[PDB]
Design an enzyme around this catalytic site. Sequence first.
Site, PDB file in Angstrom:
ATOM      1  N   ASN D  43      22.624  92.917  19.877  1.00  0.00           N
ATOM      2  CA  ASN D  43      21.847  93.040  21.143  1.00  0.00           C
ATOM      3  C   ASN D  43      20.703  94.137  21.262  1.00  0.00           C
ATOM      4  O   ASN D  43      20.426  95.042  20.400  1.00  0.00           O
ATOM      5  CB  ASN D  43      22.936  93.047  22.165  1.00  0.00           C
ATOM      6  CG  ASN D  43      23.711  94.186  22.362  1.00  0.00           C
ATOM      7  OD1 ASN D  43      23.795  94.746  21.342  1.00  0.00           O
ATOM      8  ND2 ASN D  43      24.117  94.752  23.624  1.00  0.00           N
ATOM      9  N   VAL D  44      19.847  93.694  21.993  1.00  0.00           N
ATOM     10  CA  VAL D  44      18.498  94.469  22.199  1.00  0.00           C
ATOM     11  C   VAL D  44      18.367  94.529  23.673  1.00  0.00           C
ATOM     12  O   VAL D  44      17.848  93.600  24.197  1.00  0.00           O
ATOM     13  CB  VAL D  44      17.302  93.950  21.580  1.00  0.00           C
ATOM     14  CG1 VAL D  44      16.063  94.905  21.560  1.00  0.00           C
ATOM     15  CG2 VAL D  44      17.846  93.599  20.143  1.00  0.00           C
ATOM     16  N   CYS D  54      20.660  88.946  23.712  1.00  0.00           N
ATOM     17  CA  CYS D  54      22.207  88.979  23.277  1.00  0.00           C
ATOM     18  C   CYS D  54      22.469  88.943  21.493  1.00  0.00           C
ATOM     19  O   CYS D  54      21.535  88.177  20.989  1.00  0.00           O
ATOM     20  CB  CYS D  54      22.821  87.793  23.944  1.00  0.00           C
ATOM     21  SG  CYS D  54      23.454  88.043  25.430  1.00  0.00           S
ATOM     22  N   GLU D  56      24.228  86.920  19.756  1.00  0.00           N
ATOM     23  CA  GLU D  56      24.419  85.684  19.333  1.00  0.00           C
ATOM     24  C   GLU D  56      22.993  84.874  19.467  1.00  0.00           C
ATOM     25  O   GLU D  56      22.952  83.891  18.713  1.00  0.00           O
ATOM     26  CB  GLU D  56      25.354  85.023  20.244  1.00  0.00           C
ATOM     27  CG  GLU D  56      26.738  85.611  20.613  1.00  0.00           C
ATOM     28  CD  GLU D  56      26.973  86.642  21.725  1.00  0.00           C
ATOM     29  OE1 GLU D  56      26.200  87.562  21.658  1.00  0.00           O
ATOM     30  OE2 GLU D  56      27.604  86.474  22.764  1.00  0.00           O
TER      31      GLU D  56
HETATM   32 ZN   LIG Z   1      25.225  86.413  25.770  1.00  0.00          ZN
END
Ligand SMILES: [Zn+2]
Lengths: 126, 126, 126, 126
Positions: D43-44, D54, D56
Amino acid sequence: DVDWNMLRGNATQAAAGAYVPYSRFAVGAAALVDDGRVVTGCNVDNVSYGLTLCAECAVVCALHSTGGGRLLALACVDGHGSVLMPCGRCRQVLLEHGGSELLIDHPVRPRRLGDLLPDAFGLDDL
Amino acid sequence: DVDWNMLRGNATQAAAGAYVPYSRFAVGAAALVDDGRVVTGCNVDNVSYGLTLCAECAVVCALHSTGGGRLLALACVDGHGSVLMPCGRCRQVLLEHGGSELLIDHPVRPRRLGDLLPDAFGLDDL
Amino acid sequence: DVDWNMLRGNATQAAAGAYVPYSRFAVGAAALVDDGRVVTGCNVDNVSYGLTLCAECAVVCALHSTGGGRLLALACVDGHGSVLMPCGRCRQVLLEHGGSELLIDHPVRPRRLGDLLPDAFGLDDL
Amino acid sequence: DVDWNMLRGNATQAAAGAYVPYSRFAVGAAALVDDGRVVTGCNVDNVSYGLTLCAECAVVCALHSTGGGRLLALACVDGHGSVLMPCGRCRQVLLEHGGSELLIDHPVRPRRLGDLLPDAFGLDDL
Ligand SMILES: [Zn+2]
Ligand SMILES: [Zn+2]
Ligand SMILES: [Zn+2]
Ligand SMILES: [Zn+2]
């Protein structure tokens, strides 16, 4: 000087990987990081169009998957290799990782990100 | 010709509605539409922070729920009533609905959105 | 019982306001709030497709512009009045404001949001 | 047939790269692609929280930067290596690239994405 020919070329190569079955609008981006490596990204359509990922955001993901650091320069191009200005969302996210002096490729003259997003929202506001 | 005191006031009132359990940073916005009505919006946190809705985006949702049209002027303020510059995402979203001449409140002098998002990504690029 | 005919009708009316010059896919949504009022939303395209606002997110903005509260039931429809399941992003954002028991309209049998987004990411994870 | 210990480990390693100055909530993800390679993401945070990326989604960007293909299995973990369920947005994004049979790691038993996002919004709706 930034090797814009090299960045633009890497952005073009990246655009070939774009997942754009709905938009049919391939976008690629490549950025020079402050350790000298280049990271790349392409856009990714979603059937819910509002979950589409921008090439420039993909670049930022690659940045932090490959050791982190700061962005010094970025080129964004469409599927024909034409230079694109990042959308506003991407200007804000790029600012987080390269600041006002991050250079953004342009058909005539690359621009400081601070000129493309002046008086930017940020930490001072929180 | 724009009543900034009125817009700023409505933006302040809008901020009181903010759903900010996680960020604790309330934001409100209000915009004058080209039929003379005013529409408002506030930010809305999500537990997945990347799904947070900006006040200015909420204004645009309100615009199209109340008859559509074009935005002429917008003020955005924090919970303390201090004027905020929109984030890059919001600059792009607002541009779609008010264009380069949409005026954005600022503590010193309101600005054209065109100056806050120059050489913007747009229809010509698609 | 929820008056699904009324909600579906309000969602359909809301869809007429959709700003969809690029997607050409109008979406409307309407929700019953726990004080008995109904709030509505429509989708809003952006030229950067990834900044598109969903109808269901617009509903959530309307919720907090009109006094806040909790959502009890929601219907989402396309431009032809056909019932749509919310996208995953919207499932997460609706969950924030109505929880697992929020009822979501469906062509056969309205569903609990908890069934449409089981084992949801949330506060426990933060 | 999926080496979950390996995927979970790579997800944990990915989380170390997380850019989380504001949320302080590191997330990493790793996915097995149908050619047998593994791609990762973290994540960022952004100062405008709604522009947060996210893990993902970062995985999906990596997928299309490294040759494309389909996702077969994904593990998502927090900074402590605890297995996380993806947020709704990420469930929709992952569905585009792995479909209903994409397996998602879970502390008890990995789940089909189809079970985590049933009756999903999709191509049939457009
Ligand atoms: Zn997410
Ligand atoms: Zn962008
Ligand atoms: Zn914003
Ligand atoms: Zn949605």
